[PDB]
Design a protein around this nucleic acid. Structure first.
Ligand code: SF4
Ligand SMILES: [Ca+2]
Length: 344
DNA sequence: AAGACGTGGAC
DNA sequence: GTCCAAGTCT
């Protein structure tokens, strides 16, 4: 019923599509940015970030020419920062190697950093009309119900099957709207919980509904870490911060010098990292910060700084009124907030 | 394959 | 507490 189905989906879409910021046009650059921001992130959260992001970097050229620090700052608080570092580099690549024109060939576009099987399909089909499937968790949730599939969507290979299913039923006469319509359905109707099957435009074609299992689909299958953090201030008002390693957790983001005490190292633990010297005091407070794969149990230690040498390594000395210029993980934003209300 | 990789918000 | 939401990389 490919053609019939395609009609009920696309029709519902034409009359129900939300007017979101990135839907004002089909500009490749803007679709690409939005698609990256939306990955594992709530639309309500992305909206403000996209509008601020595009206002700051209006075109692919603007983003390519910006310093990663300014870009990380624009991404501050969105999470999975590796997404923007991949995007930045891909945009630089497009500019220099492709003449600032986003490749419209899957094989060419897919080679860019951050562009996986979903993003190639999403960006090329919405912005160029290239008939490629754009399968992500949303699309897999929808198709697993329409075609009652019990394959764990967490399995690497499961996606390939759903992509096959899309190549099969896709409306080649307008893939962009077909791909985008599947996502809207998953977002507005066929939701994770309580899918609104009774008002669904493609209910007639749904196997999961016929069997009354729509709500059990799709089928889908952390370490605790004590962290010691020190807020160091000059007899003048400056504080010590540093730029995290360029690989791994919160890469290239700034933070207050910290140390994984993986136990009860304590104030002395951070002290050992003084090897430029200073001393600390009692812990201002302790709180937890969760990640997808771990939970940081942080403890903040106030301390005074006394200049006895240069400031090298990743370290950097910054005036209180200059901190708002660096991108800090949310956990360190609270560290500093705690510090400020403590002293105040 | 399976685990790294953030965050604010419904239940 | 749980489970996230329009994945990608290794
Ligand atoms: S009927 Fe229900 S489960 Fe089936 S596609 Fe519509 S909303 Fe999804
Ligand atoms: Ca790729």
């Amino acid at each position: 019923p490919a053609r019939e189905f395609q009609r009920d989906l696309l029709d519902w879409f034409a009359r129900e599509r939300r007017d979101l910021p990135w839907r004002k046009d089909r500009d490749p650059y803007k679709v690409w940015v939005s698609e990256v921001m939306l990955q594992q992130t709530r639309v309500e959260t992305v909206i403000p970030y996209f509008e601020q992001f595009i206002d700051r970097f209006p075109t692919l050229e603007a983003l390519a020419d910006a310093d990663e620090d300014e870009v990380l700052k624009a991404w501050e608080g969105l999470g999975y920062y590796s997404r923007v570092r991949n995007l930045h580099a891909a945009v630089k690549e497009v500019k220099t190697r492709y003449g600032g024109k986003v490749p419209d060939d899957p094989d060419e576009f897919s080679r860019l950093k951050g562009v996986g099987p979903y993003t190639v399909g999403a960006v090329l089909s919405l912005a160029y009309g290239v008939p490629e499937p754009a399968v992500n968790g949303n699309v897999m949730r929808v198709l697993s119900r329409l075609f009652l599939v019990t394959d764990d969507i967490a399995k690497c290979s499961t996606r390939k099957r759903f992509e096959q299913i899309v190549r099969e039923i896709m409306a080649y006469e307008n893939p962009g709207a077909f791909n985008e319509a599947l996502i809207e359905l998953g977002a507005l109707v066929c939701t994770p919980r309580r899918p609104s099957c009774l008002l669904c435009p493609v209910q007639a074609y749904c196997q999961a509904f016929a069997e009354g299992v729509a709500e059990e689909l799709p089928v889908k299958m952390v370490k605790q870490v004590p962290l010691a953090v020190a807020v160091l201030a000059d007899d003048e008002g400056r504080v010590l911060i540093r730029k995290r390693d360029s690989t791994g957790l919160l890469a290239n983001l700034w933070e207050f010098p910290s140390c994984e005490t993986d136990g009860a190292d304590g104030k002395e633990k951070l002290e050992q990292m003084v090897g430029l010297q200073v001393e600390l005091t009692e812990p201002i407070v302790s709180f937890e910060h969760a990640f997808s794969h771990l939970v940081w149990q942080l403890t903040v230690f106030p301390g005074r700084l006394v200049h006895g040498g240069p400031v090298e390594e990743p370290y950097r000395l910054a005036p209180e009124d200059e901190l708002k210029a660096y991108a800090f993980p949310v956990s360190h934003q609270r560290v500093w907030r705690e510090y400020k209300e403590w002293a105040s």
